[PDB]
Amino acid sequence: ASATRVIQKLRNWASGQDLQAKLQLRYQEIAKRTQPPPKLPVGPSHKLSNNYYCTRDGRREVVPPSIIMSSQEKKAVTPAPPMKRWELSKDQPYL
Amino acid sequence: AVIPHGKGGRSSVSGVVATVFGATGFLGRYVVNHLGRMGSQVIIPYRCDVYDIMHLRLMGDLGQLTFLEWDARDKDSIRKAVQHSNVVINLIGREWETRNFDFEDVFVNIPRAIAQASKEAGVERFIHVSHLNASMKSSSKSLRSKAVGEKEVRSVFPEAIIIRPSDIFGREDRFLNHFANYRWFLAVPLVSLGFKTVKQPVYVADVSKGIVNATKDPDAVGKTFAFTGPNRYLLFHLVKYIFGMTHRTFIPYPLPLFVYSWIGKLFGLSPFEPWTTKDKVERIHISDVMPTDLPGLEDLGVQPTPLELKSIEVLRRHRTYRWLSSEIEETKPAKTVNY
Amino acid sequence: VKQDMPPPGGYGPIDYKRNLPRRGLSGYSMFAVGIGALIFGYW
Amino acid sequence: TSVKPIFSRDLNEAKRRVRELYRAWYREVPNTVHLMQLDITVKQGRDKVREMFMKNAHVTDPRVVDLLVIKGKMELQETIKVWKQRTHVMRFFHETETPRPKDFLSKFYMGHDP
Amino acid sequence: VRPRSDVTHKQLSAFGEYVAEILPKYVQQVQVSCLDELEICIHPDGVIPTLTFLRDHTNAQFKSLADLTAVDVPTRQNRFEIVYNLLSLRFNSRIRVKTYADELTPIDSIVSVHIAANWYEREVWDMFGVFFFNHPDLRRILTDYGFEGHPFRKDFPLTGYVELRYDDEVKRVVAEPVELAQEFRKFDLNSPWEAFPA
Amino acid sequence: QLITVDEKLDITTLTGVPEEHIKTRKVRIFVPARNNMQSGVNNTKKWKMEFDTRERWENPLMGWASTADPLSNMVLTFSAKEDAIAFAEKNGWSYDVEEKKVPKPKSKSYGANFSWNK
Amino acid sequence: TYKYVNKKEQESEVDMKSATDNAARILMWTELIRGLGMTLSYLFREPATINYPFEKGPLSPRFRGEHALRRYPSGEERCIACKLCEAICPAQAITIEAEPRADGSRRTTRYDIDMTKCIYCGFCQEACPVDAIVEGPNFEFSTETHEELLYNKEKLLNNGDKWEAEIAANIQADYLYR
Amino acid sequence: ITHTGQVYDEKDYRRVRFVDRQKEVNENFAIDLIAQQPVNEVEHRIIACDGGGGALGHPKVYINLDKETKTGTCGYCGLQFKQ
Amino acid sequence: LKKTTGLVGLAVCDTPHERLTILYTKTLDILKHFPKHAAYRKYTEQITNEKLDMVKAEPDVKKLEALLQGGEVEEVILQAEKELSLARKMLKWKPWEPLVEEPPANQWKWPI
Amino acid sequence: NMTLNFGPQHPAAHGVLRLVLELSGEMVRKCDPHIGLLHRGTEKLIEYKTYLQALPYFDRLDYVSMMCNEQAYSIAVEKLLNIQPPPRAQWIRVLFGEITRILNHIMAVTTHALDIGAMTPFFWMFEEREKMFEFYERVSGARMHAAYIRPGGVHQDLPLGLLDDIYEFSKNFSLRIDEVEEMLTNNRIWRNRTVDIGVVTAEDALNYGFSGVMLRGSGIQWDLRKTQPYDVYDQVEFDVPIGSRGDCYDRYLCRVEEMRQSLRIIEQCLNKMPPGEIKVDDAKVSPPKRAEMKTSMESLIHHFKLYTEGYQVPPGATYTAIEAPKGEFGVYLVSDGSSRPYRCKIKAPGFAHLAGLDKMSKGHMLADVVAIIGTQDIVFGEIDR
Numbered sequence A: 001a002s003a004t005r006v007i008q009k010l011r012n013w014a015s016g017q018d019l020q021a022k023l024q025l026r027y028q029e030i031a032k033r034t035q036p037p038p039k040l041p042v043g044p045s046h047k048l049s050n051n052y053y054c055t056r057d058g059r060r061e062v063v064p065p066s067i068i069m070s071s072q073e074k075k076a077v078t079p080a081p082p083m084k085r086w087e088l089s090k091d092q093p094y095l
Numbered sequence B: 001a002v003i004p005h006g007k008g009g010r011s012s013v014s015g016v017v018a019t020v021f022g023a024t025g026f027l028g029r030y031v032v033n034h035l036g037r038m039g040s041q042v043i044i045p046y047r048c049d050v051y052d053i054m055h056l057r058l059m060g061d062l063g064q065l066t067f068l069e070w071d072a073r074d075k076d077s078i079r080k081a082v083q084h085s086n087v088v089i090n091l092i093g094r095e096w097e098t099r100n101f102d103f104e105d106v107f108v109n110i111p112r113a114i115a116q117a118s119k120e121a122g123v124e125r126f127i128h129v130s131h132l133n134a135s136m137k138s139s140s141k142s143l144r145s146k147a148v149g150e151k152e153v154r155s156v157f158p159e160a161i162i163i164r165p166s167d168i169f170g171r172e173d174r175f176l177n178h179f180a181n182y183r184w185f186l187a188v189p190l191v192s193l194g195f196k197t198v199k200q201p202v203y204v205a206d207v208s209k210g211i212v213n214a215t216k217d218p219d220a221v222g223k224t225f226a227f228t229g230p231n232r233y234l235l236f237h238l239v240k241y242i243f244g245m246t247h248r249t250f251i252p253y254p255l256p257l258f259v260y261s262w263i264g265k266l267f268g269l270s271p272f273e274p275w276t277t278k279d280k281v282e283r284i285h286i287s288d289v290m291p292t293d294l295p296g297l298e299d300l301g302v303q304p305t306p307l308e309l310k311s312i313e314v315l316r317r318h319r320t321y322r323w324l325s326s327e328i329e330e331t332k333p334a335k336t337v338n339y
Numbered sequence C: 001v002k003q004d005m006p007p008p009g010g011y012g013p014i015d016y017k018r019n020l021p022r023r024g025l026s027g028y029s030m031f032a033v034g035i036g037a038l039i040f041g042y043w
Numbered sequence D: 001t002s003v004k005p006i007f008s009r010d011l012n013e014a015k016r017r018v019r020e021l022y023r024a025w026y027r028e029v030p031n032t033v034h035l036m037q038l039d040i041t042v043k044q045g046r047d048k049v050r051e052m053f054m055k056n057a058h059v060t061d062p063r064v065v066d067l068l069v070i071k072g073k074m075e076l077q078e079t080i081k082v083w084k085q086r087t088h089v090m091r092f093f094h095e096t097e098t099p100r101p102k103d104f105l106s107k108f109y110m111g112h113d114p
Numbered sequence E: 001v002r003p004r005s006d007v008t009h010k011q012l013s014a015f016g017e018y019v020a021e022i023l024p025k026y027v028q029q030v031q032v033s034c035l036d037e038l039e040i041c042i043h044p045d046g047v048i049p050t051l052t053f054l055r056d057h058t059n060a061q062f063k064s065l066a067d068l069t070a071v072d073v074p075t076r077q078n079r080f081e082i083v084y085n086l087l088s089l090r091f092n093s094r095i096r097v098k099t100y101a102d103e104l105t106p107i108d109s110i111v112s113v114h115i116a117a118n119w120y121e122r123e124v125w126d127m128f129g130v131f132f133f134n135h136p137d138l139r140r141i142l143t144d145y146g147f148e149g150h151p152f153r154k155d156f157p158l159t160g161y162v163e164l165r166y167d168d169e170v171k172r173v174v175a176e177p178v179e180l181a182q183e184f185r186k187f188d189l190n191s192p193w194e195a196f197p198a
Numbered sequence F: 001q002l003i004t005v006d007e008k009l010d011i012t013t014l015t016g017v018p019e020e021h022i023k024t025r026k027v028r029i030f031v032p033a034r035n036n037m038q039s040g041v042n043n044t045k046k047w048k049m050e051f052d053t054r055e056r057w058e059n060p061l062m063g064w065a066s067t068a069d070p071l072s073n074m075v076l077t078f079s080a081k082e083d084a085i086a087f088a089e090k091n092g093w094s095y096d097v098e099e100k101k102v103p104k105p106k107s108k109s110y111g112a113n114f115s116w117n118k
Numbered sequence G: 001t002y003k004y005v006n007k008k009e010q011e012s013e014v015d016m017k018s019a020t021d022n023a024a025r026i027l028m029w030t031e032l033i034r035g036l037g038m039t040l041s042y043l044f045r046e047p048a049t050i051n052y053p054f055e056k057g058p059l060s061p062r063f064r065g066e067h068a069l070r071r072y073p074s075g076e077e078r079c080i081a082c083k084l085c086e087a088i089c090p091a092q093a094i095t096i097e098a099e100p101r102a103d104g105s106r107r108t109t110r111y112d113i114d115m116t117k118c119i120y121c122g123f124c125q126e127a128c129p130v131d132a133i134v135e136g137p138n139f140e141f142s143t144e145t146h147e148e149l150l151y152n153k154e155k156l157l158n159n160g161d162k163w164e165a166e167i168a169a170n171i172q173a174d175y176l177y178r
Numbered sequence H: 001i002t003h004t005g006q007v008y009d010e011k012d013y014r015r016v017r018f019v020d021r022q023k024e025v026n027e028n029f030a031i032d033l034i035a036q037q038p039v040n041e042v043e044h045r046i047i048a049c050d051g052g053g054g055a056l057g058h059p060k061v062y063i064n065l066d067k068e069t070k071t072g073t074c075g076y077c078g079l080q081f082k083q
Numbered sequence I: 001l002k003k004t005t006g007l008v009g010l011a012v013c014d015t016p017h018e019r020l021t022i023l024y025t026k027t028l029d030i031l032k033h034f035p036k037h038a039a040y041r042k043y044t045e046q047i048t049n050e051k052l053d054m055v056k057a058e059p060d061v062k063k064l065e066a067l068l069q070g071g072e073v074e075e076v077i078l079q080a081e082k083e084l085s086l087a088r089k090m091l092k093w094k095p096w097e098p099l100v101e102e103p104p105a106n107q108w109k110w111p112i
Numbered sequence J: 001n002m003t004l005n006f007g008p009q010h011p012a013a014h015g016v017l018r019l020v021l022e023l024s025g026e027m028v029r030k031c032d033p034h035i036g037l038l039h040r041g042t043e044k045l046i047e048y049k050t051y052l053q054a055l056p057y058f059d060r061l062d063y064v065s066m067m068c069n070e071q072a073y074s075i076a077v078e079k080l081l082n083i084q085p086p087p088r089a090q091w092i093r094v095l096f097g098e099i100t101r102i103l104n105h106i107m108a109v110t111t112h113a114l115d116i117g118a119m120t121p122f123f124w125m126f127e128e129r130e131k132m133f134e135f136y137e138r139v140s141g142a143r144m145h146a147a148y149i150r151p152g153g154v155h156q157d158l159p160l161g162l163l164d165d166i167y168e169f170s171k172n173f174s175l176r177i178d179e180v181e182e183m184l185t186n187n188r189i190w191r192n193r194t195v196d197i198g199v200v201t202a203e204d205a206l207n208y209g210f211s212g213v214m215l216r217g218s219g220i221q222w223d224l225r226k227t228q229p230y231d232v233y234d235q236v237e238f239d240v241p242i243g244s245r246g247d248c249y250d251r252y253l254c255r256v257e258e259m260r261q262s263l264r265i266i267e268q269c270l271n272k273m274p275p276g277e278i279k280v281d282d283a284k285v286s287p288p289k290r291a292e293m294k295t296s297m298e299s300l301i302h303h304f305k306l307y308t309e310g311y312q313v314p315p316g317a318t319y320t321a322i323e324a325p326k327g328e329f330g331v332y333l334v335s336d337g338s339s340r341p342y343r344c345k346i347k348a349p350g351f352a353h354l355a356g357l358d359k360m361s362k363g364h365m366l367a368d369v370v371a372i373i374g375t376q377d378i379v380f381g382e383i384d385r
């Protein structure tokens, strides 16, 4: 910014775009420093009641892998339902 | 002292804290290499700007190599360098008497003050290096002056080892490169057509390893070892051999020395490191002395390495693209002269 | 309480699609310019 | 016992392959010392080849031998198709490292744990 | 606690049975993790056959090889556990086929079944030392040209045995036995108390 | 068809270990004991084989411990004594197995502490 | 939802007008001239560079930068050698050995952060219970020699004293967040 | 010299390191700086030293100032309190 | 009819219904040699028969694409002959046989 | 064939690449890329490090998409712990994940041009990239290599000014894509250099395991962000930019579209980010808050144990793949019950792509190979690991 109008007009034209509206250099639009102090929210599990960990510890309630076909009519089954075709976009199908 | 712990490589300790005043030198570079490899504490007094001693930094490990600013005329600088060293090695030498330093200074004057302080400090041992065949009467001022020193330093520092190496063979050496660089000169003058000046080169490393071994051995005290080599040579084969590996024509033409000492005087006048020296010339045609003396290599623990073996590496830079790939086997060897 | 969050009502809308402008002189008209220069220049 | 054969049914057939590799390396040593401008002697290098080929002379099992040449062949390929520069090759010669004595008295004098 | 849909643990489970039935000569175990992931386990000889069936079967197309890896359980007689993770862009599902290979008992190569494996198989040889027969060009990929030893093996020291520095005397980089200036501090971290039955 | 070999799998030649550390390294197969500090026994379950300890000299510049032995920090964990012994034999390291020593059963009963005559 | 990029929906049959427009595009390099206009445009925009010594690129309070050890306002160094800063360091950088000081207090005889080993993760900042080791704002501590980069307790404590005022302000701004 | 009496012996060579350089040490030593702070005369048997500044201080701990002879000292600050 | 399939390399196959009917009938034939109760024969025969039946039943390719999924019809052709190739391969492999060899004990025990 | 190696120092070699080329004249008949020049031992070091102290390693595998990389480890470890991140954290990971894909694509499109010879696009976007890092630095303290996305949840709440600043960047960023759009998308010189170069057929791309923009560029429709929605990619709407033909142009155009589509996803995340906690509330998995550890004993014990020892994730193994900007980045983490992992195979979108260089660069000049590496967006950290 701080550009004489003519330079701006030359700029906008040569570029073909209103570069003034979206300048790259930042001027007094960037968040001021020393933004106010933050009081962040405490999440769940901070209840002082009905908060038993045994009821909220997925870490080791996990079990050893389930085993099928261990070494020690029927229809065909796929790894999973065949995938669904993606659909062309509607805002900008092409380009 | 420092009990030696470790497996033997870098990042290990050997317990040798050693001031080495002329480390930047061709021999020096090698001395710091082994000392650093072994894990010894090395203090390198330097005068040239830091840029030039960078090559020494990677050698040795962190906090194992310490560089101190030092001036030969200023006695105080030598004083603080040896403050905390227990081994002092002196490699101060030059071939061209410089405007502000005379052969006496570089060989006898300075190397005295140094050992003198070393004693005041209480260094266990001092190793002083002087050129081989150095009579107090030898023709070259250099050799004679060096002889003068080996005497003096003994009075400043008694029982100070005095290794006395021959001209050294190694990459970046003069003995081998000088002759090879005679290429620029269309003709390669050789006094007496390169005869009657049998010479015995010695690989730099051998010299270095020897020197280092001295530092870590009680057997050497007041010893004047002479690292010599694995084979002698009449200067003729040496010159041609060199030109042989360099793959450049060899044109031995005799030149009366009386006139040649003058050529040395000429380049000697050069402001920027004269390439040849009147004192050099004499030295080059100064015959290598015979080997009857406190032995050096082998005696100190390293078996000498023949010249032909590593010559290929020293003389390779002087070849042309055409011969670069050529190898030692293709080339012929020179002949020794037990004489 | 005070945490960094979208302003009430949400932020405004941001453009992502290419906005390259097809701005130029039509081809026939263009040819004429150069051709005219040559035609006149030759005369 | 009861092992499956990797490539060689028996030490005999396997040894055949070792012979081939030796030849390969033997024929190659000279070239490397020239294409890498290594400062070694062809004879010297060829002895090194022998050293290595025997360092593993004790192996009696056919499977171990077969892998050994597979690996050996791979090394040759890296040195004839040159992807391994001098630093790599010379390492074989252990040129810079200081040799350690194996004499008991020697070790006693130097290392806590021999 | 993560949300788990049993639709998948059922779909995948069934498929597992389907694969097993179709390839009973090699499938030893077929399990679905609690994380809804199938992991057919095959005898090493079934490497070629089981993969091919998955790459080219209408009811199980597993076109791309996500990864080929080899965990090393030193205790296990067959040290390595080659694991091949595959993806089916058609059925949006992944499966893992894992085999076992010892140090000197090579596995077949699947470069034929998936050419993606050309590189990963070289990676497994370089790091773990398993060998793959019929591989077009097996040669070290990640390690240095002269490296001796297979690095990711659990029996290989982290720091290794060789390190490099430049030596002036020889004016060339030179290996030396590793000498470290602060050894890796090996904190013992396992607690003497278990967490659950698992 | 399979071929027969009575040779103890020794693969010392393929592992890629420097000669010095295969012939001078003794490894001990032991089940770790419990630091008496804690009473948990989950670290006294699996067998471990650990290579012999080596030089740990002080570093001159910073005083940090420095080690020249590569196989020092390596402790491999093996589930059973038989499997660990196998690893030593094929890798060529010397082994000296120590039998697991488990606490002997001890009879305890709260009543005893209130014994008429103890 | 997918989107075709570079897919021509249909075959527009050449119409002279179309052909001319195209031929003109190839003959008189029309699109090439378009590209030149864009660069000429910026030539006129204000450059974004900053005088580096005089002006500095903005760093907010959480910037990790260079390690420092803080002290209590009274003057007692905060560290009590629990040594979990050593435990959680990913690179093995921090080396701590301790012994009971004469006062009887717990303190670290040696605290050495090897900055060349450190990868400035900022977990040590996280882990410390007394928050004695903090990631200080300074990023300009480039050193001529490798040894200078290794830092003992005295350098870090001195680093802490020099930057304590800003470190305190930075921790003041970000502690509610942590 | 340093906080812990770390003084290289007159013969040690690490002193070469300090040659032509400053051995970094801090004049402000904690052992002394804590002493200056006076004993806090609280009037409750057990008081707590949160470390000063709450979350910006050290883990909260309660000290028993019951011993009439001695004074409680926070294992963290070193601050002393007496009843 | 279509101009081209999304996939770059694949090319539009005219007479797609005929091409599929050829491939589908072939596979069914090869499967006829598999052991009678062989799992692959029963399972793939069921899949292929349903695919043909649909291909026979639907004369519109776009709806055919919906009925047996397959995205574009050209892909279904590639999948069918890929399966035809594997059916030939498995007859040689004989994977319908029992397990080649039981895993060494404790081979599959992960907690270790 | 005049063997010539594309040595590491060369700028087009990404710092470490030794492509042994066989030049049949200027036409190159074979490439044998010699990677390994940046193998750091990332996966043997992780075995010796606890799950939190190995997070940092994942920010250095692909070094241009740091947070998306650390969202793959975070999802894996989280799966093996059957714990899920809190709602705000999942939006923050999707917000930071798309800032990283804009950041990787600006890296890939502009450096590709630097290799071809266009120099200005790099400078215009790189200023837009430091604007973005600032967002990393303002949320984590590191411009890059943040360590913000933690195995459970993310580490710290967004500062109170970040979402406004991300709106201002996203508001004006599209013009910046539009600007290189004009300067490098229709230039006959770019099109000629990029169009019809390194075409890869659809089935060949699946067979070579390409799995990325390389998969989508040839028309295969696969995005792990819509197919297998990780985190919240089920509650954000975007269009995968599938290309049609596969030339290096269609792949460029796709990368430029994904930057645009990511601005659409970033918009939704700022518009709909929930109030809440940023890390799961299980002290066993995520470390206790600074105030709590300094006032409650259960929290100090949990802080001490978590930092010193670790999560101790339950024994199991998982392969979790997320759509990293380069392609499918997956971690096969095998876990014993111990706090430190047993194996961590980082699948790198890039090990597969570089393998394809020999097939893709077929019948191509020395110059085409520079474009072929550029269009694989290969970062050797991920390949070498």
Ligand SMILES: NC(=O)C1=CN([C@@H]2O[C@H](COP(=O)(O)OP(=O)(O)OC[C@H]3O[C@@H](n4cnc5c(N)ncnc54)[C@H](OP(=O)(O)O)[C@@H]3O)[C@@H](O)[C@H]2O)C=CC1
Pocket (backbone or CB within 6 Å): B021, B022, B023, B024, B025, B026, B027, B028, B046, B047, B048, B072, B090, B091, B092, B093, B094, B095, B101, B105, B106, B129, B130, B131, B132, B164, B165, B166, B167, B168, B173, B174, B175
């Ligand atoms: N062929 C050979 O090299 C032989 C050498 N010798 C002896 O071995 C020693 C080492 O030889 P070499 O390394 O070739 O010698 P150099 O020419 O390489 O110089 C050795 C060192 O001495 C230093 N030096 C020289 N003059 C002065 C001065 N006036 N003040 C301070 N320092 C000075 C130099 O430092 P700087 O460059 O920074 O000034 C240099 O680092 C010599 O003293 C020589 O007498 C003996 C026989 C053969």
Ligand SMILES: COC1=C(OC)C(=O)C(CC=C(C)C)=C(C)C1=O
Pocket (backbone or CB within 6 Å): J011, J012, J013, J014, J015, J107, J108, J111, J112, J114, J115, J378, J379, J380
């Ligand atoms: C974006 O991809 C890459 C480059 O090419 C544009 C590189 O230049 C380089 C290295 C380039 C230099 C010389 C700074 C790297 C590391 C890279 O990742």
Ligand code: SF4
Pocket (backbone or CB within 6 Å): G078, G079, G080, G081, G082, G083, G084, G085, G086, G096, G127, G128, G129, G130, G131, G132, G133
């Ligand atoms: S954590 Fe904080 S206090 Fe505990 S030791 Fe490391 S630094 Fe000192």
Ligand SMILES: [Zn+2]
Pocket (backbone or CB within 6 Å): H049, H050, H051, H074, H075, H076, H077, H078, H079
């Ligand atoms: Zn206190």
